[PDB]
Amino acid sequence: KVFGRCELAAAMKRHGLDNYRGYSLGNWVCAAKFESNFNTQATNRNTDGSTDYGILQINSRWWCNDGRTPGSRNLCNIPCSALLSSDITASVNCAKKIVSDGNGMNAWVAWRNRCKGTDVQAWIRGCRL
Ligand SMILES: CC(=O)N[C@@H]1[C@@H](O)[C@H](O)[C@@H](CO)O[C@@H]1O
Ligand SMILES: [Cl-]
Ligand SMILES: [Cl-]
Ligand SMILES: [Cl-]
Ligand SMILES: [Cl-]
Ligand SMILES: [Cl-]
Ligand code: NA
Structure with missing residues (x-):
């Protein structure tokens, strides 16, 4: 599923991410937006052989099991496929564990390079929330 901006804001808010x-x-x-372009079906293979999954491009090296990342962890205790659902619950529940891990949102390279220190409020401007 490709989310609209305001549609995803409302879904993230419903699932407890606003000020998480x-x-x-x-x-x-x-x-x-910068990790997946709001596409729940986004996948990207890393140089190390790990893969990033879903709307927040969560990595199989640490967070989920895809059966093809030797020596990796599954710290969210989910198959990576669950992160590709039209329903964002699995991606949100894993995002909560990641951002609590000590490094905050710096775990998301696109957030660090394209969102961090910018007017992030523009992304929810005009939305019914
Ligand atoms: C929290 C999380 O899994 N972030 C991943 C990161 O590990 C990975 O390196 C990158 C791919 O380049 O996409 C995401 O930002
Ligand atoms: Cl947009
Ligand atoms: Cl594996
Ligand atoms: Cl949803
Ligand atoms: Cl923080
Ligand atoms: Cl904001
Ligand atoms: Na894994």
Whole structure:
């Protein structure tokens, strides 16, 4: 599923991301826009053989099991396929564990390089929330 901006903001808010560990909703929407272009079906293979899955491009090296990342962890205790659902619950519940891990949203390279220190509120401007 390809989310609209305001549609994803409302879904993230419903699932408890707005100000989760101090990160305003705009941060999460901005991160999804630059990680996946709001596409729940987004996959990208890393140089190390790990793969990033879903709207927040969560990595099989640490967070989910795809059966093809030797020596990796499954810290969210989910198959990576669950992160590709039209329903964002699995991606949101895993995002909560990641952002609590000590490095906050710096775990999302696109957030660090394209969202961090920007006017992230623009991503939820005009939305019914
Ligand atoms: C929290 C999370 O899994 N972030 C991943 C990161 O590990 C990976 O390196 C990158 C791919 O380049 O996409 C995402 O930002
Ligand atoms: Cl947009
Ligand atoms: Cl915001
Ligand atoms: Cl594996
Ligand atoms: Cl949803
Ligand atoms: Cl933080
Ligand atoms: Na894994």
